Design a protein around this nucleic acid. Structure first.
Ligand code: K
Ligand code: K
Ligand code: K
Ligand code: K
Ligand code: K
Ligand code: K
Ligand code: K
Ligand code: K
Ligand code: MG
Ligand code: MG
Ligand code: MG
Ligand code: MG
Ligand code: MG
Ligand code: MG
Ligand code: MG
Ligand code: MG
Ligand code: MG
Ligand code: MG
Ligand code: MG
Ligand code: MG
Ligand code: MG
Ligand code: MG
Ligand code: MG
Ligand code: MG
Ligand code: MG
Ligand code: MG
Ligand code: MG
Ligand code: MG
Ligand code: MG
Ligand code: MG
Ligand code: MG
Ligand code: MG
Ligand code: MG
Ligand code: MG
Ligand code: MG
Ligand code: MG
Ligand code: MG
Ligand code: MG
Ligand code: MG
Ligand code: MG
Lengths: 122, 203, 51, 50, 155
RNA sequence: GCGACCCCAGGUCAGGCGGGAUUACCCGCUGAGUUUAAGCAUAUCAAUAAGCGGAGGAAAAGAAACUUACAAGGAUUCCCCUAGUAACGGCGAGCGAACCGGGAACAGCCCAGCCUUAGAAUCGGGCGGCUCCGUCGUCCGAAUUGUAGUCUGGAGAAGCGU
RNA sequence: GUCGAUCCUAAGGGUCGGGGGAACCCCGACAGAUAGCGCGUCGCGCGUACUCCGAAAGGGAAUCGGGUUAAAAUUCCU
């Protein structure tokens, strides 16, 4: 009957483009009916077809993005669109390792004289 | 250990050797623009005691600043006010020439962090400083525990908030006790605290 | 427009009565609670209270 | 005037679209308080200022 | 100005109304500080909630030299007399002040005894579970290993 | 002429960084007059408003070139007190801190310089692998006009042994 | 495509570098390794610091009749 998204994800790339082509052609006819005094029932189909076109485009874009992220997985440099967004300030932060870097003497103090666990007898 | 010889030689600025070297350098600087990148510090001994290290990420710029006081920037020297405020000349900027040199380099080099600076030469018209800047984005800096503190956001434009060595001087922070107490934590913070009218609940 | 003498938050809302006077008031109230005439006079229904 | 920029003509087109009565079915909605179009403009009474 | 009155000297000629400090948050501040102390006590358990051991010091000037109070930290000379290395003292709840001098024997001896008393009733857990090293206690880690609230060596 | 170095120039060269917005609090600069003085010019309003910049969840300050003169305290900040006081002021109008003392909190530290010279032991980048905020290998660079270690006056280096 | 804008430069405007300036900003090709262009097929030659904005009346490639709409035309039709 209507478009089911989980069924679209099982289709191949060519099938989605073919279905997208049909949906756009169908929507064009509905637009003609809207200006030629089409029946009210046919004017309600515009909303359904518009939803279908968006769903097909969403599946196509999601698959394309997912494949690209797998291609650049484990690569040093990624396209800016695929890099994490977060915030500007968060991206400029020192890494976790860099923030914890200390001098050799500071490292030795942590080992030689760390805070000890102790208690006072009552 | 050669730096002590260089440092002691630079303490004798009126000797013939230094007067000749400074005279030639002063001419050379006048011919170049007011802010110039230098391949290496002119005073390596002085630079490294202010934090400079000979590694990628550290850069040195020479800044030229004009000498003298601060003429009040008012049209035709006309002041609309009482005589106490009618002075135009013999007015002095509250910040020092060293601070100005840091600010000039900092504003121009927005992608770098100002670390420190030092005097290198002067004539009657101009004063010359070298400003040490750090590329906080360079990996060599970010992996160095002694300098990577400057990569944190709280240290943005230290020179424009008076947080450099020259900044602490003109804010009155070089010193403590009865002669400098009004400068901490800041002069305006002290004023606001002392002006506060504390109206407690039970008074 | 603007009201006359606008109300300010630093009005003196609180009061600190001396502690010894506050203890005096509490003791008087405790003593008054043992007088049935006063308890009745305050509107309490203690007609069936044993004591 | 007849000589007009693309930008100005686009702005004038939007103003024309906004210069209409409210649909009648708007006043029949639940909890409706919109009585009429309070931003109606007449070319001779109030000028667009550009 | 009229009548016989004290000469007024109200300092209300500036924009003082912009610098009024109210205290309506005073109860809230008490609540927040109590919560911080309660949270801190659980973090440092079983270490005492009173914090590090502080030395006994005299009040300054002629007006307060007859009384004693808590100081910042034990001097290096006091720590050496008590046989506690300065780098180990802060890790077992002893405050260290490398600036304080010792002009008299009485002041030095008072704090040295204070350190020895503190060490007498100090239980130190081993850094690692099984192996026990010098300075650590044995069989006392469970008997009386509780978090003491309030001062333990009051001045 | 061929090379090394120095300085500089060009590059849509490879990979990074910066600008602007926001106003309650915060940091730097600049900076009035109304007003008060029953006039008014110093003063006061005010080291304030307006103006120009820069940050953060806090900022700033901070481990004494301090307080003090005592039987001495011991980074910074904040509250109470000091105190409408010492002082300043056409000593007029007015103005005005700090130390001690009691509390909130509590934390200390890192470099520069003489000291690897039987070995730049340091770091970046390209490429590759792995247990991928990193680590390992390799190559090319940075650096001796000095990277990394050791040291920071509270010490410390060296030697000796517990 | 043919009417204009668009192109060109005018008084002037906005700027690089440089010089000033706490900064907002000031001067404006004046402190300077210009822009590039041409001819061969990457090489030779040339090369005086703005390839910028600034005119619906200045300069300026090319459209004429006839017909057509309720409302458009040297733009639609022939
Ligand atoms: K003025
Ligand atoms: K005055
Ligand atoms: K009276
Ligand atoms: K408050
Ligand atoms: K590598
Ligand atoms: K024209
Ligand atoms: K002409
Ligand atoms: K025709
Ligand atoms: Mg370099
Ligand atoms: Mg009209
Ligand atoms: Mg208007
Ligand atoms: Mg007033
Ligand atoms: Mg105390
Ligand atoms: Mg590039
Ligand atoms: Mg007057
Ligand atoms: Mg009057
Ligand atoms: Mg008057
Ligand atoms: Mg302001
Ligand atoms: Mg900003
Ligand atoms: Mg933020
Ligand atoms: Mg906080
Ligand atoms: Mg800070
Ligand atoms: Mg020190
Ligand atoms: Mg103190
Ligand atoms: Mg009093
Ligand atoms: Mg004043
Ligand atoms: Mg204070
Ligand atoms: Mg105190
Ligand atoms: Mg070294
Ligand atoms: Mg050693
Ligand atoms: Mg030693
Ligand atoms: Mg024409
Ligand atoms: Mg012209
Ligand atoms: Mg301009
Ligand atoms: Mg310029
Ligand atoms: Mg020229
Ligand atoms: Mg042109
Ligand atoms: Mg033009
Ligand atoms: Mg014309
Ligand atoms: Mg017509």
């Amino acid at each position: 009957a209507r478009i089911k998204v989980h069924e679209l994800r099982n289709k191949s790339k060519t099938e989605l483009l073919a279905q997208l082509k049909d949906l756009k052609a169908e929507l064009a006819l509905l637009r003609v009916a809207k200006v030629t005094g089409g029946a009210p029932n046919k004017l309600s189909k515009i909303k359904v077809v518009r939803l279908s076109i968006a769903q097909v485009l969403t599946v196509i874009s999601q698959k394309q993005k997912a494949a690209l992220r797998e291609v650049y997985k484990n690569k040093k440099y990624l396209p800016l669109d695929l890099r994490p967004k977060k915030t500007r300030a968060i991206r400029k932060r020192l890494t976790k390792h860099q923030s914890s870097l200390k001098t050799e003497r500071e490292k030795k103090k942590e080992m030689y004289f760390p805070l000890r666990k102790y208690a006072i007898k009552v | 250990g050669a730096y002590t010889y260089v440092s002691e030689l630079w303490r004798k600025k009126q000797s013939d050797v230094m007067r000749f070297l400074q005279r030639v350098r002063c001419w050379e600087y006048r011919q170049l623009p007011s802010i110039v990148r230098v391949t290496r510090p002119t005073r390596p001994d002085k630079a490294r005691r202010l934090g400079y290290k000979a590694k990628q990420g550290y850069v040195v710029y020479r800044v030229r600043v004009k000498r003298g006081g601060r003429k009040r920037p008012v049209s035709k020297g006309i002041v609309y006010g009482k005589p106490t405020n009618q002075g135009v000349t013999q007015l002095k900027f509250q910040r020092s020439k060293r601070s100005v040199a840091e600010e000039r380099a900092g504003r121009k080099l927005g992608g770098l962090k100002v670390l420190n600076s030092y005097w290198i030469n002067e004539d009657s018209t101009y004063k010359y400083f070298e400003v040490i800047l750090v590329d906080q984005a360079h990996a060599a800096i970010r992996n160095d525990p002694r300098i990577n503190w400057i990569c944190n956001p709280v240290h943005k434009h230290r020179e424009l908030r008076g947080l450099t060595s020259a900044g602490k001087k003109y804010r009155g922070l070089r010193g403590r006790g009865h002669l400098h107490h009004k400068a901490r934590p800041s002069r305006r913070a002290t004023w606001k605290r002392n002006q506060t009218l504390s109206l407690r609940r039970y008074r | 427009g603007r009201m006359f003498a606008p109300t300010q938050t630093w009005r003196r809302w609180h009061r600190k009565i001396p502690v010894n006077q506050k203890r005096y008031a509490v003791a008087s109230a405790i003593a008054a609670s043992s007088v049935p005439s006063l308890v009745l006079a305050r509107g309490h229904r203690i007609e069936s209270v044993p004591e | 005037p007849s000589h007009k920029s693309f930008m100005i003509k686009k702005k004038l087109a939007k103003k024309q679209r906004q210069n209409r009565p409210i649909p009648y079915w708007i006043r029949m909605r639940t909890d409706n308080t919109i009585r009429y179009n309070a931003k109606r403009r007449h070319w001779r009474r109030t000028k667009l200022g550009f | 100005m009229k009548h016989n009155n004290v000469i007024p000297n109200g300092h209300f000629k500036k924009h003082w109304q912009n610098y009024v400090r109210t205290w309506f948050n005073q109860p809230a501040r008490k609540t927040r500080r109590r919560a911080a102390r309660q949270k801190k006590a659980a973090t440092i358990f079983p270490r005492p909630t009173a914090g590090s051991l502080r030395p006994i010091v005299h009040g300054q000037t002629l007006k307060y030299n007859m009384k004693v109070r808590a100081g910042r930290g034990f001097s290096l000379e006091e720590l050496k007399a008590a046989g506690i290395p300065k780098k180990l003292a802060p890790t077992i709840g002893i405050a260290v002040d490398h600036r304080r001098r010792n002009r008299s024997l009485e002041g030095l001896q008072t704090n040295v005894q204070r350190l020895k008393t503190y060490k007498a009733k100090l239980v130190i857990f081993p850094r690692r579970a099984k192996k026990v090293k010098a300075g650590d206690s044995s069989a006392e880690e469970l008997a009386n290993a509780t978090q003491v609230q309030g001062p333990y060596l009051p001045i």
